[PDB]
Amino acid sequence: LYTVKAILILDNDGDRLFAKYYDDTYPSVKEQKAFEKNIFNKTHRTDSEIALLEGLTVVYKSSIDLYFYVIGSSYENELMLMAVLNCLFDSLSQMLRKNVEKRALLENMEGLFLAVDEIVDGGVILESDPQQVVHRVAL
Amino acid sequence: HLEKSAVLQEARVFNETPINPRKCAHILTKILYLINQGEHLGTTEATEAFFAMTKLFQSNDPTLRRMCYLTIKEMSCIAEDVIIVTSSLTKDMTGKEDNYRGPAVRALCQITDSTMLQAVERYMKQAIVDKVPSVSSSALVSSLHLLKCSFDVVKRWVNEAQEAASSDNIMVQYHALGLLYHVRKNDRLAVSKMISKFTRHGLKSPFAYCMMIRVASKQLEEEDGSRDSPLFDFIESCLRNKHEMVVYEAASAIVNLPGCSAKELAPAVSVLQLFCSSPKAALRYAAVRTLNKVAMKHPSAVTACNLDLENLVTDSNRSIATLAITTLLKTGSESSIDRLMKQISSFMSEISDEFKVVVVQAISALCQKYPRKHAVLMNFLFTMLREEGGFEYKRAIVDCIISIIEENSESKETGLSHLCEFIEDCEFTVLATRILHLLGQEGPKTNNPSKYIRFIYNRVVLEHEEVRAGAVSALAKFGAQNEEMLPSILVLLKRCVMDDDNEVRDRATFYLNVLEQKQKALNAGYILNGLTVSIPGLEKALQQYTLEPSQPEKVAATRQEIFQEQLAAVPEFQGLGPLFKSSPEPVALTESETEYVIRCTKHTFSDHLVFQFDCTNTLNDQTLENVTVQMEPTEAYEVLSYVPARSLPYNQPGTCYTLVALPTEDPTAVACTFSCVMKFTVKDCDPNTGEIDEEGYEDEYVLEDLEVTVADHIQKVMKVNFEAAWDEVGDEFEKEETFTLSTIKTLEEAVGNIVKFLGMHPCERSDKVPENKNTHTLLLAGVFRGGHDILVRSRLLLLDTVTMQVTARSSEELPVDIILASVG
Amino acid sequence: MPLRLDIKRKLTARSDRVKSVDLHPTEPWMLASLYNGSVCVWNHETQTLVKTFEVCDLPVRAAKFVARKNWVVTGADDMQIRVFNYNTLERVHMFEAHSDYIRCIAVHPTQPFILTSSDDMLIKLWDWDKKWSCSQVFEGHTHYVMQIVINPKDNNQFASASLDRTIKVWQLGSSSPNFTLEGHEKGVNCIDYYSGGDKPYLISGADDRLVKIWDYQNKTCVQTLEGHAQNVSCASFHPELPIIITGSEDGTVRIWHSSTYRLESTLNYGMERVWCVASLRGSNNVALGYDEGSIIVKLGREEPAMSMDANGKIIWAKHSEVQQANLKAMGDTEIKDGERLPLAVKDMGSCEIYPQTIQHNPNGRFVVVCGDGEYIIYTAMALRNKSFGSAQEFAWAHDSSEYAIRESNSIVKIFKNFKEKKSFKPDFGAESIYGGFLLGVRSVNGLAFYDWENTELIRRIEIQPKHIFWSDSGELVCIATEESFFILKYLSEKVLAAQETHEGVTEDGIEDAFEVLG
Q1: CB distance from B118 to chain C under 8 Å?
Q2: Which chain B residues are Cβ-neighbours of A125 within 8 angstroms?
Q3: What are phi and psi of C433, to 5 degrees?
Q4: Interaction with ZNF289/ARFGAP2: where is this region (chain B)?
């Protein structure tokens, strides 16, 4: 039981606006931020549903001032990961009552924290239905 | 954003009277923020905040409940007296609504430990069966965590877990099947039953397929009892649902290790399954690939090729381009290498920085991995040296040089020499070390060492200590290997450079003094070619693969020797007949990893047989001591001694032996059957590998019989001329008996049966007899135990069945009698 | 989902609408209370009616035994509970239990109490020892109190079901219900507890066609049971077996597995309108009250499935340190013959099917779990899937690397190395199988023995067996029979001439090939 390695929603530098680690491989801030900077540097300023970083398929999207991440295994493809990443974007948008930017996330830090935990649970994909997550969470 | 101290502190008011759901929920949000933003909690304040929050569980608000679940999990480990929160979580967990249901099970189960396991079970059973994915999936992941604390509680849930498995809802199923596989496992077979039930089904759950593919990927033919095929009717071997990841995972395993063979609607040996998905968008990345494939990656490679090769060349996007190189690499092979190398050459042009280093490494690495000649590898290694000039490193000097001395060395030094012309001190410590090491070691007569020396001499001045030190020591070895060289050593070493710097001086003082002053017994000894400091494997090629898209020794050779060694350690067996031979037909008494694994071999000596029983107690509940394998011979054999296996704990082999004396007058065979029973003392054990209880009971385990054949007594040989040998061994021990082999209708099978049974190789290759000939003479030879030859002559008559008069002669009465009896 | 069952009609009796059915607290008798104004009790083991009591001339809705006094309590539309001695045949006491007829009575053997539930919306307590004085009156229910049951974890607690959409848990001490459960949505006909020392459960039945399971500890509704396709008259929990037995006014009774609530059986009788259910607390008898009579029914699973090899893996399924679904057990203990030996279990690997029968190999190399028309073979002590096969029944023979199976095509099958043997296929038909070397197959009022050599009829023994077991030489057989027991001789040579010749008739055999030794 494992698909998603970690979820990060990063500003346009790779610094932690947010990350919640569905791996046990980053718990300390220094390394959680390093990871975040690492994934953001590869993936950014080339938007696609694919990136390969650290031998893992990284699926990412972007907004005005954020890049949104799911990191998962590379034995899969973008599309499986993408379903998590689409939930992540979508659910935060509907939850916060505003599209994902740094402003929406900061506006409601609580909605963001709770919403992401419903999407991924210890690296298993707990939820992937944006609607379900949003009802499930209370602001 | 926040300060961890202030927020951890103000949380302590909850512990008293104030509960205020708004204030506390905010304070909680702040805790989650401190972690999220990236901060570390202080333990005293954390411990205090944790005891305080539990009061807050009284007020049931969905946002406050939510805050409470995330905060207790994060604060659980950095907190004390957490046990109080279990009750509050159960209270929450039974409360209907997904907000409570799912999030509570997860928070509760994380905090829950084997004592507490029992409490959560009613609520857990109710939460697992849900086709509402949140409650069920959270409960299913929760159960996975709980397998650690206590296995047994979780196991009972297998029925609720299975119930979820029957959903086609993606989460409920993914979680249900995945978890089940982990849970119910006590043997392979019970998990396999769980998998077969879902297996025939065309799911609309890609995640379940994926998690299951992995379980499935190996051939399973015991799914739900048994079945006649490795069959997976869920995409693993089938292609019921198309979706490029699932399709890729499935297609690479099935092709050359069938999960099932190819179907018209589901390729599974053929290369196709990947390829139909292959032209695509970003999605293509899974689709385009390969791995394994029938019979090679190469017929496969051609399909996909348009896609991988155009993206790889065109896209100087890192994200696309990486998928394109990995995809090229995958469609690759030995054959593909011509194509792969041009592409990789081309690739650096798109992304050129580290990627440059990687392509010049890749083209060499691929040439070493997939052979386009070892020479070409060196020539590519020159191109790597040329292009980068510094992203070669120290590990490269050792790897290039070791690799080079397989064939390239004279050339490599020379190439290196040219390469050294580059750049005087920006070329790095490493290239200078490579030309230096190679010029030292080869001692060029292929080119004049004077260019090399002149090139190295300049480099040393302005480059690091390690090379300058390297240069003096190399020179010294260079002196010892070649006499000629000594004059250059002296001009170089007197200089302030190759000696008299710092490290360079110390090494030099030593190396110099040994060459200059001393005998050079030492210097001579020291150069064995002038080799590197270590010989590793070929490091580059694996490194390169990931990086781009970002002494077994033996004594025995014969069964008799290995056994003889095992026997020899024990005295009795070599003291009481020495071993002629040990069986060429050792029989395993009891099957592997059941109750016992016992393999017995019968060993023949001059007048004895020793039976070595290698005994394993694979009994999980026991550990054994004082174990022996007891024996009842079915003929006149004396059982002299038993040697015990000292201990046989769980899954640990031990050996026990029975020594018996052979008859040497027996009129009937030494082909004989012994009934084996192992007897032992059991002390109770908790399965690990071993552990004994303070007291225990006697127990016995029955074993299979050991059969001793004439084949064990005789070692086979053929003779150039049977007739002489046949007379020579002893016609004075001659006895003749006539047999009918009615179950063998030709001579060729007949000769084979006497040859196998007796352990005699028929002379002159007499196992091949003129097909269906009326008379034939079969010549047998071999040596019997004690070291005496046994020859047997069987004059075959072929009617419709085989009749033979078998006459045997031997240097003893016993082989003759033994052969004659065993055959019939 | 599979479960060891075997529904059997222990005794039937025809009478006007029986509202209540009971098993005698400690006796093998079942009492049914009828609308004949009579309550009648019959001991459905010897099929003797022990006694009848004429409580009233108007329906007696409830009757139960207060076994200690050797008395029976009845509540009838006299609005009285009248007490009688069931061996001295006279009316012990007469008292007015309620202002309305008494639907159910519950007896506390440990206390002098009966509480009775009546449709005067009240449940009242009477103490038999005081000569049926009113100990306590419970006021809580605002509607017709259909049924009362005593909780077996605290007899001081009972629950009463009323058509007020609740089942209220009350304590004796407290007139009022100390907490209320809202167990159903269209009134609660019945309340029952799921019996035991560690089972806090309620069930509610309602006329919304549905029976609901509730956990009284957690207070949530565990699941909803489809019940019946018409108003569920009553629902109860079986104690031993994981099922719920419900009855409906459609004349149907259904049994539901209490692990997934999938239909185990539907039973009709030609008696119809099934008003009540009750279950024996010592388990495997349930009795159900109908319009046209009462029935006492006997449920299956009477005996355990297990086998002892020579490896000390004695394997069972269910039980302690073993799960039902998976397989385990070991027994390496040899403590004194005079007492029951510990479980002594050691853990054993994978399973994939349910154990209809689960058995170790008689000399220890195989394990077989049989279930659902399939057999799965697992390895003796490693439990990796060895083999698979078909088996509605599986029996190891004597050979135990040859076994008999009923594949249920009307020929008894032999599987050898867990692979089917078609050199074995009876020239009898089949109705059933006995293992051992000469396979006994029962058909056409005969027991026929078949060869594992050419499947010809060796002999037919004219008393059918319970079992055939054959010795481990295969010349001597032990036949379990209604006759009592046979030992028969199979003369091997006589069989070889007879079988080849096929002088043994298709369905009658040759009476020489086998001979009756004793």
Answers
A1: no
A2: 171, 174, 207
A3: -130, 150
A4: 559-824
B187–C contact, CB cutoff 8 A: yes
Contact in structure between C236 and C255 (CB atoms under 8 Å): no
> Residue type at B680?
F
- Distance (Å) from the alpha carbon of B105 to chain C's nearest alpha carbon: 14
- The continuous run of DSSP H or E covering B817 comes out as helix B813-823
Query: How far out from the chain centre does Cα C481 lie?
Result: 25
Does the beta-carbon distance from A80 to B37 stay under 8 Å? no
Strand partners, C401: none
Distance from C-alpha of B332 to C-alpha of B27, rounded to nearest angstrom: 57
**Distance, C-alpha B701 to centroid of its chain:** 33
Rounded Cα distance, A100 and A86, in Å? 12
Resolution in A: 21.0
Q: Do B619 and C323 touch (CB under 8 A)?
A: no
Rounded CA-CA distance B190/A47 in Å is 46
Elucidated via: cryo-EM
Cβ-contact B170, B211 below 8 angstroms: no
Q: Are B616 and B590 in contact (CB under 8 A)?
A: no
Please state at what angle helix B85-93 crosses helix B98-111, rounded to 10 degrees: 150
Restricting to B residues 588-627, those with a Cβ less than 8 Å away from any Cβ of C are: 590-596, 618-622
Rounded Cα–Cα distance for residues B467 and B463 (Å): 7
Nearest to C324 by CA among C241, C236, C239, C225: C241
Listed by number, the residues of chain A in 56-95 with a beta carbon closer than 8 Å to a beta carbon of chain B are: 57, 75-80
User: Cβ distance A49 to A62 under 8 Å?
Assistant: no
Amino acid at C124: K
Q: Report CB contact under 8 Å: B244, A53.
A: no
- DSSP H/E element including C360: strand C357-360
C504: number of Cβ within 10 Å: 26
Q: How long, in residues, is chain B?
A: 824
Q: What is d(CA C329, CA C319) in angstroms, rounded to the nearest whole number?
A: 9
DSSP for B582-618 reads E-SS-EEEE-TTSSEEEEEEEEEESSEEEEEEEEEE-
Structure token digits, residue C456: 């010809």
Question: For residues C254 and B754, what is the distance between their CA atoms, to the nearest angstrom?
Answer: 70
Residue C423 · residue C456 · CB < 8 Å: no
What own/partner pairs with CB < 8 Å and gap ≥ 24 does C262-268 have? C262/C1, C263/C226, C264/C1, C264/C3, C264/C5, C265/C5, C265/C7, C267/C7
Q: CA nearest B688 in C: which residue? A: C347
Q: Are B379 and B368 in contact (CB under 8 A)?
A: no
Q: Which long-range contacts (CB under 8 A, 24 or more apart) does C28-35 make?
A: C29/C65, C30/C285, C30/C287, C30/C294, C30/C296, C31/C63, C31/C64, C31/C65, C31/C72, C32/C63, C32/C287, C32/C289, C32/C294, C33/C60, C33/C61, C33/C62, C33/C63, C33/C74, C34/C59, C34/C60, C34/C294, C35/C59, C35/C60, C35/C61
CA distance C515 to B691: 56
Q: Give the span between the Cα atoms of B153 and B150, in whole angstroms.
A: 6
- Is residue C168 classed as helix, strand or coil in its secondary structure? strand
Query: Quick check: A20 and A7 in contact, CB under 8 A?
Result: yes
Whole-angstrom distance, CA of residue B512 vs CA of residue B495: 12
* 3-state SS, residue C450: strand
Residue A29, sorted as left (phi over 0), alpha (psi -120 to 50) or beta, turns out to be alpha
3-class DSSP assignment, residue C476: strand
Check: CB of residue C396 under 8 Å from CB of residue C435: yes
Contact C106, C158 (CB under 8 A): yes
- Count the residues in chain A: 139
The full length of chain C comes to 518
